């Protein structure tokens, strides 16, 4: 017997990578004694000071939940203390509290 298939050919491309996203870390704990005076003297660090209105004004907040905060405990929406610390360049994790660690970059 004999066989004689075709030939073809093609050229496709275009690829497109993405990121995944996981962030789901439900865990009730206070925001943390270093945190609260972290978030204070980190704010204070801003130009000429970032004042607790200020501050609740630009994350969403009001000024007594800032005040709350610095206090060490005003139930940490992960999603407040992101843009608190983020807006001055500051971390409240690790050793080196109140600086910038692993926060505009995490290199």
Same mark, same amino acid.
């Given at each position: 017997?004999?066989?004689?298939?075709?030939?073809?050919?093609?050229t496709?491309?275009?690829?497109?990578?993405?990121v995944?996203?996981?962030?789901?870390?439900?865990?009730?704990?206070?925001? &943390? /004694? #270093?945190? %609260?005076?972290?978030?204070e003297?980190?704010?204070?660090?801003?130009?000429? =000071?970032?004042t607790?209105?200020?501050? &609740? /004004? #630009?994350? %969403?907040?009001?000024?007594?939940?800032v005040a709350?905060?610095?206090?060490g =405990?005003?139930?940490?929406?992960q999603?407040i203390?992101?843009?608190?610390?983020?807006?001055?360049?500051?971390?409240?994790?690790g050793?080196?509290?109140?600086?910038?660690?692993?926060?505009?970059?995490?290199?």
């Amino acid at each position: 017997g004999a066989m004689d298939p075709e030939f073809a050919g093609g050229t496709e491309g275009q690829r497109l990578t993405k990121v995944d996203r996981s962030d789901d870390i439900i865990k009730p704990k206070t925001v &943390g /004694k #270093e945190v %609260g005076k972290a978030i204070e003297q980190g704010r204070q660090k801003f130009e000429p =000071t970032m004042t607790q209105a200020e501050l &609740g /004004k #630009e994350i %969403g907040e009001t000024a007594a939940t800032v005040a709350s905060y610095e206090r060490g =405990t005003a139930t940490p929406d992960q999603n407040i203390l992101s843009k608190m610390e983020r807006v001055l360049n500051v971390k409240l994790r690790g050793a080196n509290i109140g600086a910038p660690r692993l926060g505009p970059k995490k290199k």
